[PDB]
Amino acid sequence: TSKINKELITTANDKKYTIATVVKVDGIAWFDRMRDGVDQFKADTGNDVWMVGPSQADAAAQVQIVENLIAQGVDAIAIVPFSVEAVEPVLKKARERGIVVISHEASNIQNVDYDIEAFDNKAYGANLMKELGKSMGGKGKYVTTVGSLTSKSQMEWIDGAVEYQKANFPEMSEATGRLETYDDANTDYNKLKEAMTAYPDITGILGAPMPTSAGAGRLIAEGGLKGKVFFAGTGLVSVAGEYIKNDDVQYIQFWDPAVAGYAMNMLAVAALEKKNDQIKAGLNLGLPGYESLLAPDAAKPNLLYGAGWVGVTKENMD
């Protein structure tokens, strides 16, 4: 399911490694989709890889999970942090045990061997604002969502989205502060509905974590509100396609966490095969979206991007 045609040497010699992928939450479309990725990697490599996460999204549950992994003397850790502040300790601990750490969606992380981002997050959120802005006519009031308030990427998107609006749609403004919805759609529902009857006007929703797409879709379907309240954010067609075809939510974007999952494990073995002097800018993974990597910060030269995402109202996807 990950297209592996061009590819590299994540190879040898003659060893297989044990690499766990630690994710925000095990349960929802996004990471199910990542799981196909990690598993295909196991097919194509025979490394002891698997994916694990909290039953429900929790800072402390991820921390615990990594602890388990510490206890097992695993070879690498690949983590998509729910709260970066929360895991930097147990990761520091891990590195001490000569464990390799690969991060994702966590660009300000320090204690990793490397971190990879699918794209420029500032740019990403801006593209969500560019859309939402049109829908609303660049005039109304809007509200934003994040999973954790310590999910870096999502903060970056919302930061990059607000920054656009202030420069491009100065007659719009954040109706209220950011909503922590904790990557749960039923919770994005309640928190949106709550802010609806507190600021009834609000005619725009900006969603960073995938479920918000479902959560806001649901709210728009139930009561009014098609055409009066607009949505732009991350989503998958899996969880939101019907809300798109029904005119309920107007634009969603994303990347393929299956490929992102692959890339992570590739970097993990590269590191583990001690090719650290090859994991640098311009490096080609040979995966769609990872053909040339970027290290834009001179200060964090092991912060890698990652280029390109996907926009939808033409649902070709799964």
| Experiment used for this model | X-ray
Residue 140 CA from chain centroid, whole number: 28
Helix (H/G/I), strand (E/B), else coil: 64: helix
As beta bridge partners, residue 294 has: 305
Q: What domains sit in the chain, N to C, each tagged with a CATH number?
A: 1-119+256-318 (3.40.50.2300), 120-255 (3.40.50.2300)
* Strand-pair category, 18-22 with 76-79: parallel
CB 37 within 8 A of CB 2: yes
**Nearest of 309, 278, 283 to residue 294 by alpha carbon:** 283
* Distances in whole angstroms, Cα of residue 177 to Cα of each of 51, 57, 62, 281: 33, 21, 26, 37
CB 199 within 8 A of CB 193: no
Q: What is the dihedral of CA 132, 134, 137, 142, to 10 degrees?
A: 10
CB 19 within 8 A of CB 268: yes
Q: What does residue 156 show for φ and ψ, rounded to 5 degrees?
A: -65, -40
* Strand-pair category, 310-312 with 251-254: antiparallel
Resolution (Å units): 3.0
Q: What is the dihedral of CA 255, 259, 263, 264, to 10 degrees?
A: 70
Classify residue 10 by burial, with Cβ atoms within 10 Å: 0-12, 13-18, 19+.
buried
Tokens of 22: 């630690």
Q: ∠ at Cα 86 (279, 114), nearest 5°?
A: 0
CB 281 within 8 A of CB 263: no
* Measured distance CA(290)–CA(2) in Å, rounded: 12
